Design a protein around this ligand. Sequence first.
Ligand SMILES: CC(C)c1cccc(CNC[C@@H](O)[C@@H]2C[C@H](C)CCCCCCCCC(=O)N(C)[C@@H](C)C(=O)N2)c1
Length: 377
Amino acid sequence: SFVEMVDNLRGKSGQGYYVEMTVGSPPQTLNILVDTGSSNFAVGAAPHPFLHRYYQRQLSSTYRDLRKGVYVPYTQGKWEGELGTDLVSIPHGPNVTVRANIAAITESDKFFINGSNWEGILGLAYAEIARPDDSLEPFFDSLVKQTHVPNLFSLQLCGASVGGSMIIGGIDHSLYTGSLWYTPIRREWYYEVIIVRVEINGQDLKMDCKEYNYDKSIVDSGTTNLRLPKKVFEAAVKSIKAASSTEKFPDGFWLGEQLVCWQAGTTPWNIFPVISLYLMGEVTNQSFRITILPQQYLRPVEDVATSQDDCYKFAISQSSTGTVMGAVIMEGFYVVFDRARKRIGFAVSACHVHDEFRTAAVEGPFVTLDMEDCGYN
Ligand SMILES: CC(C)c1cccc(CNC[C@@H](O)[C@@H]2C[C@H](C)CCCCCCCCC(=O)N(C)[C@@H](C)C(=O)N2)c1
C-alpha cells in the first residue's frame, strides 16, 4: 500500500523536503524535514520568529521527560534542547504509531528558515552519529523495532515549489524507470558510500580516487548542494569554468554567493557539462555511474527583483569533511536506502530532470579495478 505515501513530501528550493507527522496525544501536527545526513528526531518546542507552530509537551498525555539535555551541531546550523519520548505517527505513511525519542528544541542558531513551512527534523541515519551519543535510538530504528515495517525506505526527490515521495518500508515500482543499481553502505553511521571515478563531459578527472572520498562520501538529503573535498572541488570548478567559458560569471557565482540570471527561457544549458559519479558496485571489480545534468547543480532561485529572468545559484561547494551527495544530486533519481541489505540503490526517477539533447542516467555495469583502494582510512 505504498500509493498512500506517493507525493507525501513538499518543500521549497534550497529549503529541504519535509513530511507531515504527528507527535503526542492528542496528536499535534508538524512538518518535519527529511534528513538522511543525521540521526536525531527533533522538533521546535519553544517560540521562535520563524516557527508557525511548535511541539507543546504540556498538552501531550503521553509525553515522557528523559531528564537529559541534547545539542546537535551541523555543518551549518545548530540547536539545543531537552530529550523525551512520545507517540509519533506519519499520516501519509505506514498505519502505525511508535514511541520514539524526541528532542524538544528550546534554542537554535541558523537552523530554522524564515518562511520554510517545516518545524522539525527527522534524522534517518544510524545511531552511531546520534547525539548525545549512540544510545539514543533513532526514529527509524524504533519504527522497525516496534512494528512490521521492513527495514528500508526510499526517497524520490523532485525538482520544479518542489515535491516528492518517501516510501517507508519498501520500493514503489511506479516511481522509477530502468534498473536499480546498488552501491554498498561502507559503514552504518552516515549513509557512507565509495566514489571510484569522476568524469565531466566524459573526461576523467584523473585524481587518486581516494581524493573523492576524503575523508568520507555520504548521501545526505539534508544538504542542498553537491559538496566536494577541496582538491576535487578545484578540479571540478576548473573544468566547469572551461566548458562554459563563452560566458563570463562573477567570481562570487562560483563560490555559491552571487546568483546569475538570463532572459526567461534563454539559459544556455548546453555550455554547462554533465558530471558522472561512479559508485562501487555489488560484484567484484564492478561499478556503475550516475550522470548529473546542469539543471541539477544550477539551482533555480526566486528573482529577488523583477521575476522577468531565470536566476540560478551554483549548487556545488567546497567541503572539508568529505563528499556530500546532497538534494540536488538525489533530485531526479529514485534512491533506495536498503538498510536490511546494507546498500543504497539508484534509478532514474519518474520525475527525472529533462534536457533537450541530454538525459540524467544510471548506467552499468562498468569494470573498475582496485575499488577498495578508493576508501579513505
Ligand atoms: C548532525 C551530525 C551527524 C552532522 C554534523 C556535520 C555534518 C553532517 C552532515 N549532514 C548535514 C545535514 O544534517 C544538515 C541538515 C540541516 C542543518 C537541516 C536544516 C536545513 C535544511 C534545508 C537547508 C539545507 C542547507 C544545507 O545544505 N545545510 C544546512 C548543510 C550545510 C547541513 O549542514 N545540513 C551531520
